[PDB]
Design an enzyme around this catalytic site. Structure first.
Site, mmCIF file in Angstrom:
data_model
loop_
_atom_site.group_PDB
_atom_site.id
_atom_site.type_symbol
_atom_site.label_atom_id
_atom_site.label_comp_id
_atom_site.label_asym_id
_atom_site.label_seq_id
_atom_site.Cartn_x
_atom_site.Cartn_y
_atom_site.Cartn_z
ATOM 1 C CG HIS B 84 -2.017 -1.121 1.045
ATOM 2 N ND1 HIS B 84 -1.830 -2.281 1.757
ATOM 3 C CD2 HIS B 84 -3.139 -1.301 0.308
ATOM 4 C CE1 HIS B 84 -2.822 -3.116 1.492
ATOM 5 N NE2 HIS B 84 -3.645 -2.526 0.649
ATOM 6 C CG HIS B 88 -1.853 0.020 -4.384
ATOM 7 N ND1 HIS B 88 -2.493 -0.884 -5.210
ATOM 8 C CD2 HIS B 88 -2.805 0.499 -3.527
ATOM 9 C CE1 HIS B 88 -3.766 -0.958 -4.865
ATOM 10 N NE2 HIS B 88 -3.970 -0.133 -3.860
ATOM 11 C CG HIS B 145 -7.179 4.369 -3.164
ATOM 12 N ND1 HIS B 145 -7.276 3.062 -2.727
ATOM 13 C CD2 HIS B 145 -6.134 4.414 -4.028
ATOM 14 C CE1 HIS B 145 -6.322 2.342 -3.329
ATOM 15 N NE2 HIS B 145 -5.629 3.146 -4.111
ATOM 16 C CG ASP B 146 -4.810 2.093 -0.224
ATOM 17 O OD1 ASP B 146 -5.672 1.832 0.653
ATOM 18 O OD2 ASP B 146 -4.656 1.324 -1.218
ATOM 19 C CG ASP B 259 -8.311 -0.632 -4.169
ATOM 20 O OD1 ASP B 259 -7.069 -0.665 -4.140
ATOM 21 O OD2 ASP B 259 -9.023 -0.384 -3.188
ATOM 22 C CD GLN B 310 -3.309 -12.969 -4.928
ATOM 23 O OE1 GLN B 310 -4.460 -12.715 -4.646
ATOM 24 N NE2 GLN B 310 -2.429 -12.021 -5.162
HETATM 25 MG MG LIG Z 1 -7.377 0.508 0.827
HETATM 26 MN MN LIG Z 2 -5.736 0.294 -2.625
#
Ligand SMILES: [Mg+2]
Ligand SMILES: [Mn+2]
Ligand SMILES: [Mg+2]
Ligand SMILES: [Mn+2]
Lengths: 363, 362
Positions: B84, B88, B145-146, B259, B310
């Site tokens: 994060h 990203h 957003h992060d 995302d 995953q």
């Molecule tokens: Mg997030």
């Molecule tokens: Mn994210």
């Protein structure tokens, strides 16, 4: 460093006024005068009596010192503002206690449950919510009521959002005040071991308790009012009605209860309602003064030079309180007395106060 | 006090890698190596190129200095953690740009100010149906957003009673923080005010849209968004592009897909992202152990379970989101009538890969 509960924990000189807790029109302002204005003890003293009345100290092995420490810290953190103060918090707690303990005609009741020492009717034809809502959930509702306006600044959500106040930025404009009340009250609780009155709840119980407290506080945001009322009316009028064995139904009932308790004022006797009304507008005027200072238009009903008490209260009843009472009454949850017909004090007061404001407007 | 954008605002000599922005499998890790690892410029440099590509600087009279100042401050506040991080954020911004600008077969154009990519009957694009102000909100949301992610999940913060969890009453703890901290940053300095030419109504609306998009990235709400979107697609009339609430829902589904785009990239990219995700998890696992808590599933470095992680992420989260988005007719693709969709093809290929790993592990 920690705020600790004063002196002898329980004030002994309040007995004659405290005995009157089991009435809807509890003379809270007499209690204020008896304790002293800004003594900062009213919430903790009432909370003690109500928890004792319900046997909650025994039920959860609550250490009384830590309980009093926390509730005193909590009450001290309510500001010296005209409405959202520790007196209002005490009023809301009393109301949720009243609504959950007092006889409800025709309610069927189901250990895990507590009952008020004030509950005297032996007639099958009454029950109470505390017979249907487990003690852990009831205690969450009561604690929520005590903390639900903690550290209120005397400004509305709309004002905080419009002025980009730090709190509004912090909470992304969503239930700004209510998030803060919950978060600041919980931070306070966690800050000191001297406040840990919930020490004998297990980990699962504690986490659930916290969730319930938050859900109840957040339900007091009137932006959500119509959604709650619609959802409740939906549940009442579907295929089975309220299912007391369903945890989600019980939460919704608790939320409607704290909601009614928060806005109980217009359903009190005239004398109480008029005194609270004075507090509400006096708080609004401080907001109006700041709005003017910031070059913003003065919000409706918040202009001390042009007061509009009657329009404020008439419209609050017509749009908010009236529909909530009707919904709650339709579910058969209002305290009342068989006379068979039912006599409901709460709805009678609301009708009387609505009529009073209408008559002021007419003149 | 203020973090200001470095040197010449736009780095030259990145042109050959930047020209590849108009591909789904943009080689973002090559861009990282070209700029330098922890140069701390990747997000601001990509942001500039995409805003320029859309003509957003002209559309909203955005001053470039303040834009670069803000985006550099923002990128600096992404931590040096394995997943994060600012790489990203750049990836998510690229993906929302791609999803909103690239040809979509059979998408009709709405009958507002709209912008179009310089890269742009039988095809449409989202930027033809979503007003420029709303698109810009989506792009800014992707970048922020992060912001200041600590490398722990919401569940960890809640279980440990972390100050942020207490502050946000256990509700979308990280996502609330990303939005609030990014907005606080923005408001803290006049040197960051790239939105100075929005009027007050526009600004307030823009802020609302950004918040709604960031908060939509909370996976606790994943099935609610998907169910709501599937509802809207399958009701009376479908998506109504003239309806502001429908448009917001589309933007939310877009940032959501952006995302979690990784399993829908080529194998090389997906495997590199996977390494980052698990490395960040293991730091959380280490701390859980340290605190005497059970190690969360998939977060034990001594017992890694990449394939199970995953495979289940694709089957339960990414797959249903792609199916929902594709059912709405919003996936970029090409007419073959049938459609060829690169995105869903990659997801299928990666799912098959992990299944095969699982088979050999048993
Ligand atoms: Mg997030
Ligand atoms: Mn994210
Ligand atoms: Mg309140
Ligand atoms: Mn209140």
């Amino acid at each position: 460093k920690p705020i600790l509960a004063p002196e002898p924990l329980v004030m002994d000189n309040l007995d004659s006024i405290m005995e009157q807790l089991n009435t809807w029109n509890f003379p809270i302002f007499d209690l204020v005068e008896n304790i002293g204005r800004k003594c900062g003890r009213i919430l903790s003293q009432v909370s003690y009596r109500l928890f004792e009345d319900m046997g909650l100290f025994e039920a959860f092995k609550i250490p009384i010192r830590e309980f009093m420490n926390y509730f005193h810290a909590l009450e001290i953190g309510y500001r010296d503002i005209p409405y959202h103060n520790r007196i209002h918090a005490t009023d809301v707690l009393h109301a949720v206690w009243y609504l959950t303990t007092q006889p409800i005609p025709g309610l069927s009741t189901v250990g895990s449950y507590v009952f008020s020492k004030t509950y005297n009717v032996t007639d099958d034809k009454y029950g109470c919510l505390s017979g249907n809502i487990p003690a852990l959930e009831l205690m969450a509702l009561y604690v929520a009521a005590a903390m639900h306006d903690y550290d209120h600044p005397g400004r509305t959500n709309a004002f905080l959002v419009a002025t980009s106040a730090p709190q509004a930025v912090l909470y992304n404009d969503r239930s700004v005040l209510e998030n803060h009340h919950a978060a600041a009250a919980w931070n306070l609780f966690m800050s000191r071991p001297e406040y840990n009155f919930l020490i004998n709840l297990d980990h699962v119980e504690f986490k659930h308790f916290r969730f319930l407290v938050i859900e109840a506080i957040l339900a007091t945001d009137l932006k959500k009012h119509f959604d709650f009322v619609a959802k409740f009316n939906g549940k009442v009028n579907d295929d089975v009605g309220i299912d007391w064995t369903n945890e989600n139904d019980r939460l919704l009932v608790c939320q409607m209860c704290i909601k009614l308790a928060d806005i109980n004022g217009p359903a009190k006797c005239k004398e109480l309602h008029l005194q609270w009304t004075d507090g509400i507008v006096n708080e609004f005027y401080e907001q109006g003064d700041e709005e003017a200072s910031l070059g913003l238009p003065i919000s409706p009903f918040m202009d001390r030079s042009a007061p509009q008490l009657a329009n404020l209260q008439e419209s609050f009843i017509s749009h908010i309180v009236g529909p909530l009472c009707n919904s709650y009454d339709s579910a058969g949850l209002m305290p009342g007395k068989w006379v068979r017909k039912i006599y409901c004090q709460i709805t009678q007061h609301l009708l009387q106060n609505h009529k009073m404001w209408k008559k002021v407007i007419e003149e």
